[PDB]
Design a protein around this ligand. Structure first.
Ligand SMILES: CCCCCCCCCCCCCCCCCC(=O)OC[C@H](CO[C@@H]1O[C@H](CO)[C@H](O)[C@H](O)[C@H]1O)OC(=O)CCCCCCCCCCCCCCCCC
Ligand SMILES: CC(C)CCC[C@@H](C)[C@H]1CC[C@H]2[C@@H]3CC=C4C[C@@H](OC(=O)CCC(=O)O)CC[C@]4(C)[C@H]3CC[C@]12C
Lengths: 390, 42
């Protein structure tokens, strides 16, 4: 809660300035994000075979159609046809990956835990992701949602005092670190920053970060990815050459990583959402429901990605199945309507994420552009130097 | 000479222990992987 209670007219003009479909109402402290799970009917937690098999076999068919189309004209295709096939395959794999992320939290087919764990491992493998490290990081996210200095497995924002500290530690903005930060948080490569998250899994490939009674499970978790990049990745190259690798593997990879990064970045970032450190005003239900955003999709994309944008219906109910995530949302707006936040697909939203909302300041408790912030903390350096000439 | 071991007590336990240990190798360091499989979400 940052731009909390004031007339709804200015929050609506803010929502139109930012492309947001709504801005939340006031939320009082002392609540549990599991509370509002008592509202949903006792049939929203139901199990059925047809919906799940559709959710797994539809993006599969998308990917298969894209591959068949490509292998039909393997490398004689032009550039934008290649881009179309890459986007289609990456979207199908994002859907399959959401099925994976479902069976990782044990809420896909609880009837067969072994079969569902094997399915999650198999479907995470082609993206080079270990199932148990993913599960640990996602629970560690849920526990610290929107907490400062604590949720590093989400989109932890870069704050002001730390950037001034690095400014002094590098001796100006001309070092490698400052230039890297600028170039990564200013250009559309930010929309692919999830790649860096993939390099923060494999926690140094170090079992000293885990609980001993889990070692044999963590290593097997690092096995299915490695084995893949040890067996299949060669074969492809062997049978396709360098170009034949940049086509059938790397581009769908960048597509899936784009989808992942933008989903998360738009789900938990907004100027009307503050990032408090706990002790200095944090709360579970507040930073859960009030500091969140839900995005809108075309129903084709929603049946492809398998409800990949409904993150709150399963943050109030961690055991809510996947084919019921829209329906549950239907109930939630009926109850917490004024406090919800919503948004849609718009290149304007992404452009504001790229150019406007770049640095988080805790004084105004909101996001600011990076060049203005950098010139102004250079001005504060001028200030402290003026206090230092004598 | 001889130390008349059967009317002793430290000689009794040390003797039986050394004989038992020398009979056969009974060390098992490879049965502790069961200790690295106690938390599995499968
Ligand atoms: C698909 C179906 C999806 C269903 C599942 C949805 C789950 C959504 C949650 C997923 C969580 C993903 C979080 C993403 C994430 O945190 O990334 C966002 C993170 C940033 O996030 C924060 O960043 C901080 C600054 O580094 C710290 O690292 C924090 O620890 C880190 O959390 O991405 C980065 O690490 C980017 C920095 C690395 C530099 C980028 C280099 C890019 C290389 C060039 C790319 C190739 C050219 C293009
Ligand atoms: C070459 C491609 C096509 C196949 C797949 C390769 C991956 C399995 C490799 C490539 C990059 C590797 C990572 C690059 C860097 C690191 C850090 C490195 O650990 C450290 O540096 C320790 C911490 C520190 O030094 O501060 C080893 C693990 C890890 C995550 C590596 C894990 C294995 C990764 C993901």
């Amino acid at each position: 809660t940052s731009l909390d209670g004031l007339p709804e007219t200015q929050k609506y003009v803010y929502a139109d300035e930012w492309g947001f479909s709504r801005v939340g109402a006031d939320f009082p402290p002392g609540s549990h994000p599991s509370l509002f799970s008592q509202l949903l009917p006792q049939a929203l937690f139901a199990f059925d075979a047809r919906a799940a098999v559709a959710a797994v076999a539809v993006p599969l068919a998308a990917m298969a159609a894209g591959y068949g189309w490509l292998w039909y004209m393997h490398s004689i295709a032009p550039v934008w046809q290649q881009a179309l096939c890459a986007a289609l395959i990456g979207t199908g794999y994002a859907g399959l990956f959401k099925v994976a992320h479902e069976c990782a939290m044990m809420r896909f087919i609880p009837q067969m835990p072994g079969l569902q764990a094997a399915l999650g491992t198999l479907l995470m493998a082609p993206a080079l992701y270990s199932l148990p490290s993913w599960r640990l990081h996602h629970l560690h996210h849920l526990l610290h949602t929107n907490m400062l200095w604590q949720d590093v497995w989400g989109w932890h924002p870069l704050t002001k005092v730390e950037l001034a500290d690095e400014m002094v530690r590098s001796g100006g903005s001309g070092g490698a670190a400052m230039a890297a930060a600028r170039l990564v948080l200013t250009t559309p490569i930010k929309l692919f920053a999830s790649v860096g998250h993939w390099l923060r899994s494999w926690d140094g490939l170090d079992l000293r970060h885990f609980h001993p009674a889990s070692y044999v499970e963590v290593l097997s978790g690092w096995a299915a990815p490695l084995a893949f990049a040890g067996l299949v990745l060669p074969a492809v190259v062997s049978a396709g050459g360098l170009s034949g690798f940049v086509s059938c593997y790397l581009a769908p990879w960048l597509v899936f990583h784009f989808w992942l990064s933008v989903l998360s970045l738009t789900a938990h970032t907004a100027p009307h959402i503050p990032w408090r450190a706990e002790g200095d005003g944090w709360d579970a239900g507040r930073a859960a429901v009030a500091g969140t955003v839900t995005l809108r999709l075309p129903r084709p994309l929603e049946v492809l990605l398998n409800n990949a944008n409904y993150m709150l219906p399963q943050a109030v109910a961690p055991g809510l199945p996947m084919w019921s995530a829209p329906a549950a949302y239907a109930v939630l707006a009926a109850r917490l309507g004024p406090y919800l936040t919503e948004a849609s697909m718009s290149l304007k939203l992404l452009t504001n994420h790229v150019t406007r909302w770049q640095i988080y300041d805790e004084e105004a408790h909101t996001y600011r552009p990076m060049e203005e912030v950098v010139d102004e903390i250079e001005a504060d350096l001028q200030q402290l130097a003026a206090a230092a000439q004598q | 000479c001889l130390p008349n071991i059967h009317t002793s007590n430290i000689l009794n336990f040390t003797k039986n222990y050394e004989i038992f240990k020398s009979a056969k190798d009974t060390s098992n360091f490879g049965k502790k992987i069961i200790l690295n499989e106690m938390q599995n979400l499968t």
